[PDB]
């Protein structure tokens, strides 16, 4: 019924505010999907982030670009305890995880799959074409999609592909939250992205000076997680029978 | 002192909500700064784009990307009578335009700059230097930056880059608008992407079938402008003493 996305975790302070703030909330929502794509030092996923987003109310954890870049997602996955998703367009077979998780929210079926956009990004599996292949199961009930993608044409038409069909499609991966917010007709939830879960004053995450070096001098530079206050981006769901009733984004800046 | 950015003019569906819906807010601004990159059918700008948008209000019209798609634009520049701004950072002496004007607001002076990002785009001239040089410059009053650019990472970059030193960096060329509207210490106001004026039903302004179907089967379709109801946005901006002192988004959607 009411759920929260919360956009891609950033490193320590995207951990912080998470771990601080969602319990602040929690109450207000029946289930959390939070991305921690970039937990581990901006990249992958390491097992005391997760311990730390269940701990706080998370009840699902959604990956994508860097699934695979901190050693610790494999025993977690193999070990098969934490509710996590990570892209379900990874075709080989022996991959690694689930690409989709349904949950029992209150009596409801609430389906949570992951997806990875190609345009920009490493080619992996038809993102599209996959999603029309899960959609032909029988036991999914309210859909969730995190579209975790760079373009933002390979975003909208998403969107439009899945409008009907599922109750909300969410992206992610851009870190910068969109204000295009809307309810696709058909009662599909949608937007471009979610924003991210990390420092506030950065570049993409990252320490300022780094990358601006690296634009600067067009050589490379050493750059870490940027430091200092941390923001908070998701957006608050309301579904009902499979399909988003209310979409409205949830910003918090810690001070 | 009152100054509004109108992100790119999309076709007839964004020339259409330009002109009708311009005229209705331009009495609450001292100059309105457009821009037509994607006027001409969704590439470039003819003349009777031009015509229409100054007759609308608009002081000046800035590009990008496709600046040079319809072969109106170079008679256009040739006679410097409309004020055009293309983007600077195109390294070539002899490019037709100028990377910048500066106009007569109210009493002071208010300069408009075009830039190019190269990030998941073509390789031109390094735009953070390319403003560290105009930037140079003393006879530029109150600077305006028009980032158009693809990644967030380069856009968060140039913002960090002139904060302190141009009054607003507002990025286009993405079409969703971004919800993180700052002024940023330094008094320089930021938004990652204003979002664009063109048709609200759409993926990234085309009509639906024909990128959906290229995402699906990967073969080429012919696709166009959408068609239906038109959105507008923008940023409505305050600037004083050369920094900006307020700036919030402008957002407005046919029925």
């Keep these: 019924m009411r759920v929260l996305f919360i956009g891609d975790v950033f490193g320590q302070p995207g951990r912080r505010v998470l771990q601080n703030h969602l319990p602040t909330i929690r109450p207000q929502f029946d289930f959390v999907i939070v991305n921690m794509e970039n937990s ?9 982030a997760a311990r730390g987003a269940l701990e706080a109310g998370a009840g699902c954890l959604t990956l994508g ?23 379900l367009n ?3 077979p022996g991959t690694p995880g689930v690409g ?20 920009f990004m490493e080619a992996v599996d038809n993102p599209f074409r996959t999603m029309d292949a899960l959609l032909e199961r029988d036991d999914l ?3 969730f999609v995190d579209f975790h993608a760079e373009a933002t044409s390979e975003k909208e038409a998403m969107g439009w592909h899945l409008a009907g069909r599922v109750a909300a499609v969410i992206g992610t991966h851009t870190h910068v939250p969109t ?11 949608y937007q471009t992205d979610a924003g991210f879960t990390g420092p506030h004053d950065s570049i993409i995450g ?9 634009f600067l001098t067009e050589r490379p530079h050493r750059y870490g997680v940027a430091e200092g206050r941390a923001e908070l981006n998701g957006v608050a769901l309301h579904f009902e029978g499979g399909k988003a009733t209310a979409a409205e984004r949830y910003r918090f800046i810690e001070d």
């Design 206 to 214: 990252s320490a300022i000076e780094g990358p601006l070096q690296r």
């Design 65 to 87: 670009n860097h699934a695979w870049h901190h050693k610790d997602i494999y025993p977690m996955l193999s070990e098969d305890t934490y509710p996590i998703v990570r892209p």
């Design 90 to 92: 990874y075709a080989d």
């Design 100 to 119: 989709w998780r349904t949950f029992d929210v209150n009596g409801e079926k609430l389906t949570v799959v992951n997806l990875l956009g190609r345009v």
């Design 179 to 189: 204000a295009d917010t809307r309810i696709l007709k058909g009662g599909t939830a």
């Design 141 to 143: 009930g309210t859909v």
């Design 40 to 48: 581990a030092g901006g990249f992958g996923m390491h097992r005391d």
